[PDB]
Design a protein around this ligand. Structure first.
Ligand SMILES: [Mg+2]
Ligand SMILES: [Mg+2]
Ligand SMILES: [Mg+2]
Ligand SMILES: [Mg+2]
Ligand SMILES: [Mg+2]
Length: 409
């Protein structure tokens, strides 16, 4: 059916907290293409900022920050969060190659540059560039979140995100600006309650609305996590309606995030990023949370269309697709490719009607191209590009016929 295959099947990789090589990411892309995924969600800004453009010149606050100054500041900020021995940041040439490599396998890339929360690297970077006190300050000075009242910091980050958006414009369909937290380290995980207390929640919305307008103007579909949108189902503060919502959870006790029902009533489309499918690198059964055993179990237990805090199909809210997420909460933990591959395969195997068939063997065979020309032409026409994961044997036969016609030219 066209509807199921039209939906997004996304694997999310936390390459913000932890470094991934181009080859590691290429191998994730190829495995995603094999299993029938449509997109790779790649966090590049998440705590650490692990992506540098060739030109990092920034214009904000009536002055310009030299490209080499910005690069050096960001590298110092990212190493300040976590000095990864595997590497610090991906280059423009590496990300450009990754986008083109993914495109050749019908895989989209969804970049994520997080703010105002989860931006440890940007905060230190701004300090090195002469921007004093960029951090939010509540129970203590945050190490993760920008102060919304600091114009100097706000103007720089907007300009910085703009430059990242300029690069992804015309290369990717979607840009994720995050907005998933506000100084949870400085509020005992009560960032939204603190924004409300200090009447700065209107200022948060203004920042999120700006980022959404920045994405749309540059031809990018705006994307954000649900956390900041219409907190506690209240609408005295309005948000941009065009944002694709990465819904992952309704929160916990004292963390009253908007329900999927309420956000759906505002007209929001969801990318189902259910927290049930979460795997944090190195997480074990005794730690609780997103360990590998539970994540693999949940790919079967939690329905593809089930939004967090809802029972499916009882509550059936329209989604554009689903996203399984890999996190690197402690980036020092070892990335084991096969663990991610097993979790990716499990999600595809439980949902064979949503995921497409493996078209890698078919692409290899087409790269190798007078009753002989009639036979080759007939097998080429017989090819079916619309087969899901349930029909691999059906596709394999069609590829085998193309092989027989090609070996008899
Ligand atoms: Mg302090
Ligand atoms: Mg307010
Ligand atoms: Mg739009
Ligand atoms: Mg998920
Ligand atoms: Mg490692």
């Amino acid at each position: 059916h066209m509807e199921k295959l039209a939906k997004n099947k996304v694997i999310s990789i936390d390459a913000g907290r932890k470094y991934f090589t181009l080859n590691q990411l290429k191998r994730i892309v190829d495995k995603a293409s094999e299993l029938g995924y449509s997109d790779v969600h790649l966090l590049l800004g998440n705590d650490g900022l692990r992506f540098l453009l060739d030109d990092m010149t920034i214009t904000a606050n009536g002055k310009t920050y030299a490209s080499d100054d910005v690069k050096k500041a960001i590298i110092e900020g990212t190493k300040a969060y976590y000095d990864d021995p595997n590497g610090t940041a991906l280059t423009q040439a590496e990300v450009t190659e990754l986008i083109e490599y993914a495109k050749s396998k019908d895989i989209g890339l969804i970049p994520a540059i997080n703010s105002p929360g989860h931006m440890d690297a940007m905060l230190v970077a701004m300090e090195k560039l002469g921007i004093k006190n960029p951090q939010a300050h509540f129970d203590k000075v945050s190490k993760t979140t920008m102060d919304l009242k600091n114009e100097e910091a706000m103007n720089f980050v907007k300009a910085l995100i703009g430059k990242y958006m300029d690069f992804f414009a015309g290369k990717t369909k979607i840009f994720n600006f995050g907005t998933d937290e506000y100084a949870n380290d400085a509020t005992s995980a009560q960032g939204w309650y603190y924004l409300k207390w200090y009447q700065l929640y209107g200022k948060f919305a203004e920042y999120a609305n700006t980022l959404a307008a920045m994405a749309k103007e540059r031809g990018l579909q705006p994307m954000a996590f649900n956390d900041g949108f219409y907190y506690e189902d209240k609408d005295d503060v309005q948000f941009d309606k065009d944002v694709l919502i990465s819904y992952w959870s309704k929160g916990w006790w004292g963390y009253n995030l908007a329900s999927p029902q309420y956000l759906a009533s505002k007209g929001y489309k969801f990318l189902n990023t259910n927290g049930d499918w979460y795997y944090i690198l190195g997480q074990k059964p005794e730690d609780g949370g997103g360990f590998l055993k539970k994540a693999i179990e949940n790919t079967g237990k939690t329905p593809f269309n089930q939004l967090a805090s809802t029972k499916y199909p009882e509550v059936d809210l329209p989604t554009v697709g689903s996203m399984l997420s890999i996190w690197a909460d402690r980036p020092s933990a070892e990335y084991k490719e096969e663990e991610i591959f097993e979790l990716m395969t499990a999600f595809a195997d439980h949902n064979k009607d949503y995921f497409r068939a493996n078209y890698n063997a078919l692409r290899e065979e087409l790269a190798k191209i007078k009753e002989s020309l009639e036979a080759l032409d007939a097998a080429k026409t017989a090819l079916n590009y619309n087969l899901n994961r349930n029909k691999q044997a059906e596709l394999d036969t069609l590829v085998a016929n193309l092989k027989a016609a090609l070996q008899g030219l």
